């Protein structure tokens with residue numbers, strides 16, 4: 365059941381209308397905003413770890429992880445930053461609702477200005493709706509349990525405890541359920557370009573999960589047993605009609621993490 369106020373639904377509908385009509389040709393900028401949010405959250409927990417190192421108890425990693433799921437049409441930006449308690453999340457939503465950021469952006473757009481301040485105005489998250497019709501946020505902060513915040517393009521949201529528990533240990537995962545028009549964002553070449561572009565001044569490692577293909581010649585009888593290997597996402601054995609051939613070219617596809625900065 366939706367938990368938005370009419371004020372939240374109005375403010376966010378205005379933000380979305382302005383952001384969309386102002387950035388319809390630069391849809392890709394959502395990634396700059398999400399990476400920016402993630403670095404800010406990582407800086408918060410990094411700063412606290414200087415006085416009390418025990419804050420990193422649940423997860424020593426301090427990084428950003430980008431991964432696409434081509435079958436489910438989902439893009440995820442995950443970080444091991446501070447994360448949010450239910451209190452931090454509802455405060456953040458109340459901040460968005462009470463502020464008149466849409467007044468500032470309406471003014472910027474009417475004046476012929478750009479959306480380069482959406483990040484400084486703390487509304488950069490809503491740029492995700494340029495490419496997605498549904499955004500599912502999973503978050504975990506040391507002081508609370510893991511929560512799920514599920515938002516839609518109609519400015520409606522719902523918050524509930526994660527049935528699977530603290531799968532994140534510490535940090536936040538932004539899962540974008542992409543629109544049919546945003547398929548290009550699941551490709552390794554596009555993501556690599558976008559991440560190299562938007563990582564310029566990010567003091568934390570950014571990792572991309574991309575396809576690695578392994579090719580070798582194998583004896584036909586073993587080529588059939590290669591298919592079963594669970595260490596690979598998929599195994600493609602070459603199809604041959606000639607019973608002459610005693611060997612088969614085998615392509616083993618699997619995704620590994622590469623440091624992008």
Ligand SMILES: CCNC(=O)c1cc2c(-c3cc(OCCN(CC)CC)c(Cl)cc3Cl)nc(N)nc2s1
Nearest residue numbers: 401402405443446447448452456459460486489536
């Ligand atoms: C312990 C406190 N932790 C937090 O507050 C965290 C937030 C976030 C956000 C994040 C930040 C957002 O807005 C930034 C501006 N707000 C706060 C000034 C005012 C609305 C939004 Cl609209 C959405 C998300 Cl998901 N993103 C990420 N990856 N991590 C965190 S950890």
